[PDB]
Design a protein around this motif. Structure first.
Motif, PDB file in Angstrom:
ATOM      1  N   UNK A  70     -14.248   9.539  -1.891  1.00 25.49           N
ATOM      2  CA  UNK A  70     -14.365  10.692  -0.976  1.00 25.49           C
ATOM      3  C   UNK A  70     -14.037  11.948  -1.721  1.00 25.49           C
ATOM      4  N   UNK A  71     -13.583  11.762  -2.944  1.00 28.28           N
ATOM      5  CA  UNK A  71     -13.067  12.827  -3.727  1.00 28.28           C
ATOM      6  C   UNK A  71     -14.097  13.526  -4.587  1.00 28.28           C
ATOM      7  N   UNK A 121      -4.587  25.353   8.542  1.00 24.22           N
ATOM      8  CA  UNK A 121      -5.329  24.580   7.563  1.00 24.22           C
ATOM      9  C   UNK A 121      -4.847  23.147   7.527  1.00 24.22           C
ATOM     10  N   UNK A 122      -3.548  22.964   7.404  1.00 28.16           N
ATOM     11  CA  UNK A 122      -3.014  21.615   7.434  1.00 28.16           C
ATOM     12  C   UNK A 122      -3.452  20.952   8.737  1.00 28.16           C
ATOM     13  N   UNK A 170      -6.849  19.777   8.469  1.00 29.03           N
ATOM     14  CA  UNK A 170      -6.873  18.568   7.697  1.00 29.03           C
ATOM     15  C   UNK A 170      -6.372  17.374   8.540  1.00 29.03           C
ATOM     16  N   UNK A 171      -5.199  17.495   9.153  1.00 29.49           N
ATOM     17  CA  UNK A 171      -4.696  16.428  10.033  1.00 29.49           C
ATOM     18  C   UNK A 171      -5.681  15.987  11.151  1.00 29.49           C
ATOM     19  N   UNK A 182      -8.751  14.263   9.704  1.00 34.82           N
ATOM     20  CA  UNK A 182      -8.232  13.086   9.136  1.00 34.82           C
ATOM     21  C   UNK A 182      -8.075  12.082  10.297  1.00 34.82           C
ATOM     22  N   UNK A 195     -14.901  21.331   2.397  1.00 33.65           N
ATOM     23  CA  UNK A 195     -14.062  20.452   1.595  1.00 33.65           C
ATOM     24  C   UNK A 195     -13.374  19.428   2.393  1.00 33.65           C
ATOM     25  N   UNK A 196     -12.686  19.877   3.453  1.00 37.62           N
ATOM     26  CA  UNK A 196     -11.879  18.956   4.250  1.00 37.62           C
ATOM     27  C   UNK A 196     -12.772  17.938   4.934  1.00 37.62           C
ATOM     28  N   UNK A 224     -13.567  15.626   2.010  1.00 34.87           N
ATOM     29  CA  UNK A 224     -12.344  14.864   1.743  1.00 34.87           C
ATOM     30  C   UNK A 224     -11.965  13.828   2.782  1.00 34.87           C
TER      31      UNK A 224
END
Lengths: 364, 364
Positions: free
Chosen positions: A6-7, A87-88, A91-92, A95, A115-116, A119
């Motif tokens: 995923x990177x 932002x976090x 991402x959370x 995710x 990106x996220x 990712x």
């Protein structure tokens, strides 16, 4: 231990190469980029004092004041989760929804979304062109299943706001195709026309398909406050009728230990002085200033009233042109994405001195 | 939007049902569970002052002082990443390695590992029994491929420390089978025997297979400091020879915006006063106290010198026995996992008053 798949798919960079131009033209106003408020800091400190004397989803007082002052009653305290930044949270969130989602985003794109998404596992990423012919209403593909739709309103980079009618359309489209909407309103405080929605929860049906994330950081006045929040409606449901809000509570308990309490205490004071701040009327000014300079000097100017972004039409012609012809660094549209082509993003988040200097280099 | 698969597989709970016993026996010392230092707070405030006056992987001063004071030179500043706490870091880590890992953890287990493993996608989870016959050296399966090994040393719940010889063994075993080791040393500050390793980087070869996470939060003295750090060696490499440290930098840039700077500033002062604090000699005391009370009253006592945990041998016989026979709440071993059976975790992190009261209810 094999590397992350995923990177392997992953500016600026624009900033290095601008120091370049300076180390090569030493005789430049940087508009491609960006003090803690007195009451806020006093609260911070008092919070610290409180801690140095003897004797979870957020400080109740903060969840409350958000409900009541920030969301103007449209959102409940229990629907509000405090974290350490937008932002976090994004991402959370992504995710939390798991991989293999197909996720659509506005084009031009704020690039952290891409990106996220990449990712966190996205199966595909669908750019939704947003263009001034269409009043920047994103253009949906007939007909491709999308799972998640990221919105950014007021918009980085267009500095544009989806209005009431526009969001109602998007929400109807969303419920119609069973799309979860992620709605980023971190710039909402910059809205200066009191009609326009500030939150997606001001829009009929948003609670059956939408989450909002938001923060302080950029209202501005809030430097050194690691603080944001996420909003999940009680009503919001997965395909199988399970409640999102419930999964989110479990998730959060497992992977977060909350925002700092002094920063929380500090948010509360910030909400109080929030709607005052010429500390944003200051920028509205920069934007006015730029705008007319830009229109006077022949340009097409979009944005700038409800966010600190001017979206300007006169592709590598662009960065180096502005630097040379005007001694103004900018961020070129096509950087934020493919329907960025032909545009430049001016940022209004600077000292008045430089704003004025730039407006000058637009005369001759 | 379908619910999360990785989600559907998921105490305490022990605490509700203890308030129960109180609402039913009103005529109980709680040892099943847990003030901001003067210098630390002064630094905090001064940091705040700094911010309210006019004018990334961590504050350089903090990355430095960690290197030099905390890691005693064994770790480089550039190998050190500041975040907002050990738990979020563990989540970001396992998240970062991608799903389908098979991950081994000590049994008895600190249960957040299991969850985050489950949540982040693990293919399997292998409990590594740790028992006092074996001096708590975990027992590896012949022969099952493991990808990641979580370690917790000093240990919650045994209050036990893997020593030099033990870690050397684990590291050799790790490099031998190509296992990445995640090493949680959040309790390291409680070590009181200056021989024992405090970091895994004191151990030959640890840099070719190991990461460490650590925080302030529990040294103690650090209430309201949302602050931890992760350590990635320069040498650490995926199967294909890529450098972990490099992927980690990208990852972090994309999904984090750093710890709070005032909390960072506050860590620095905390490092200064760090090795003084009877503010931990205080607890070493509690542990001594309990221990002898426990041995006097016939029990088998393990742990308690290098962490605030006593691991005590006399399964639902246990919780309700201690409450009734002694009026002491504890956490029963089997809660932390299957080789927990027959043990109880006392926590030493309380007021001396209650510690003494408990030691009393061990006489008759």
């Amino acid at each position: 231990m094999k590397r992350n798949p995923h990177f392997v798919s992953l500016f600026a960079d624009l900033q290095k190469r601008v120091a370049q131009f300076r180390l090569e033209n030493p005789q430049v106003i940087n508009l491609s980029i960006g003090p803690l408020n007195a009451s806020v800091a006093e609260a911070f400190a008092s919070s610290i004092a409180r801690l140095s004397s003897p004797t979870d989803f957020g400080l109740p007082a903060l969840r409350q004041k958000l409900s009541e002052d920030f969301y103007r009653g449209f959102v409940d305290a229990k629907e509000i989760f405090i974290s350490d930044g937008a932002k976090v949270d994004l991402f959370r969130l992504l995710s939390f929804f798991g991989p293999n989602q197909t996720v659509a985003i506005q084009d031009p794109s704020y690039p952290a979304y891409l990106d996220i998404a990449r990712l966190t596992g996205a199966k595909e990423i669908i750019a939704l062109p947003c263009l001034q012919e269409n009043a920047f209403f994103p253009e949906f593909p007939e007909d491709t299943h999308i799972d998640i739709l990221c919105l950014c309103s007021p918009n980085n980079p267009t500095g544009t706001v989806l209005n009431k009618d526009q969001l109602r359309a998007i929400v109807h489209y969303a419920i119609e195709h069973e799309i979860l909407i992620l709605f980023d309103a971190a710039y909402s405080t910059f809205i200066s026309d009191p009609s326009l929605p500030k939150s997606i929860f001001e829009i009929p049906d948003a609670r059956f398909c939408a989450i909002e994330i938001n923060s302080f950081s950029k209202p501005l006045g809030f430097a050194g406050i690691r603080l944001g929040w996420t909003v999940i409606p009680q009503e919001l449901t997965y395909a199988d009728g399970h409640f999102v809000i419930q999964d989110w509570e479990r998730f959060l308990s497992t992977t977060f230990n909350g925002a700092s309490i002094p920063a929380q205490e500090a948010g509360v004071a910030g909400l109080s002085i929030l709607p005052q701040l010429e500390a944003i009327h200051y920028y509205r000014e920069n934007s006015d200033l730029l705008r007319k300079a830009l229109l006077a000097t022949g340009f097409e100017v979009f944005g700038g009233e409800h966010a600190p972004y001017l979206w300007v039409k006169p592709d590598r012609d662009l960065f180096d042109f502005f630097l040379r012809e005007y001694h103004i660094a900018i961020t070129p549209g096509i950087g934020f994405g493919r329907s960025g082509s032909g545009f430049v993003r001016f940022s209004s988040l600077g000292k008045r001195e430089d704003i004025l200097a730039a407006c000058e280099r637009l005369q001759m």
